[PDB]
């Protein structure tokens, strides 16, 4: 922006977010790409079943006790046996019913809960810390935001210690990976999708976008390049060049794509 205003560059082509503060100093061409502030977290581990998950519902004590009870019933029968068979039947009945019920509770609980839906959920919990970049359009959005949820989030982020802000995107993503899912990274949908399609593919985007905005090509106010560039972006848009380009760089060569 500085290079454009002070005339050190004739044009600016980059993932530059369109903002009113920037639209005041520079001129933005119609948006060539769509994005929005989104949440990135670490994808939960699919399965770590073991053989121990079958012995999870019924306690180790219950298995030992049912074994000793079993051999106890056997040695009782070795030494009338009608009430023995009956009592053992009642016993194993209550036990299999208990196992079925407890396992049902396990699976039901496991299927019932979801970690995160939207941003509002992030605002409502102190368990998972979350943050943005040290600078840029997102931080400024949170700062300048009069909307309830975002206001609360901003208050939290600025007040929170240690600092939730990171210098680079790679640092933030790395922090998401190292934090075991205790850290959420707020970044524009584009970058989120791109990192999500790249190995190790341990990261994912949750919920919709907080806001809807776009990037754009910037030209100095009153420059001759503005209208040609704008009409050019329109041409590329209708021709589908932008779409094919995004698919080229983002999805198509995506390893996990």
């Amino acid at each position: 922006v500085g290079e454009l205003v002070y005339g050190k560059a004739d044009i600016a082509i980059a993932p530059l977010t369109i903002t009113l503060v920037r639209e005041e100093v520079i001129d933005f061409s119609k948006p060539f790409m769509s994005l929005g502030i989104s949440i990135m977290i670490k994808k939960p581990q699919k399965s770590k079943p073991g053989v121990f998950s079958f012995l999870d519902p019924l306690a180790y004590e219950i298995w030992m006790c049912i074994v000793f009870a079993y051999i106890g019933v056997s040695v009782v029968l070795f030494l009338s046996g009608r009430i023995v068979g009956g009592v053992w039947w009642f016993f194993t009945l209550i036990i299999i019913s208990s196992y079925t019920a407890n396992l049902a509770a396990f699976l039901t609980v496991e299927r019932m809960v979801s970690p995160i839906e939207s941003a509002e959920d992030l605002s409502k919990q102190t368990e998972i810390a979350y943050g943005t970049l040290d600078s840029g359009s997102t931080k400024e959005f949170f700062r300048r935001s009069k909307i309830a949820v975002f206001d609360k989030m901003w208050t939290y982020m600025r007040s929170a210690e240690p600092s939730v802000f990171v210098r680079t995107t790679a640092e933030g993503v790395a922090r998401v990976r190292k934090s075991k899912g205790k850290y959420a990274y707020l970044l524009e949908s584009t970058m989120n999708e791109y990192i999500e399609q790249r190995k190790p593919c341990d990261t994912m985007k949750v919920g919709g976008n907080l806001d809807s905005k776009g990037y754009g090509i910037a030209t100095p106010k009153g420059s001759s390049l503005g209208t040609p560039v704008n009409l050019a972006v329109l041409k590329l848009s209708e021709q589908g060049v932008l779409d094919k380009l995004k698919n080229k760089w983002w999805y198509d060569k995506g390893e996990c794509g």
């Binding site: 106890g72 009430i83 009592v87 208990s98 407890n102």
Partner: protein, 32 residues
């Protein structure tokens, strides 16, 4: 998941099991 380990609650049914087996031993004894 909230791991249960419900052994305390089932312990009672284990107790009525032991009681039943005890009465069983009693009947087995009075029989012979």
């Amino acid at each position: 998941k909230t791991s249960a380990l419900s052994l305390s609650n089932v312990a009672g049914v284990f107790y009525i099991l032991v009681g039943g087996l005890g009465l069983a031993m009693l009947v087995a004894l009075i029989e012979f």
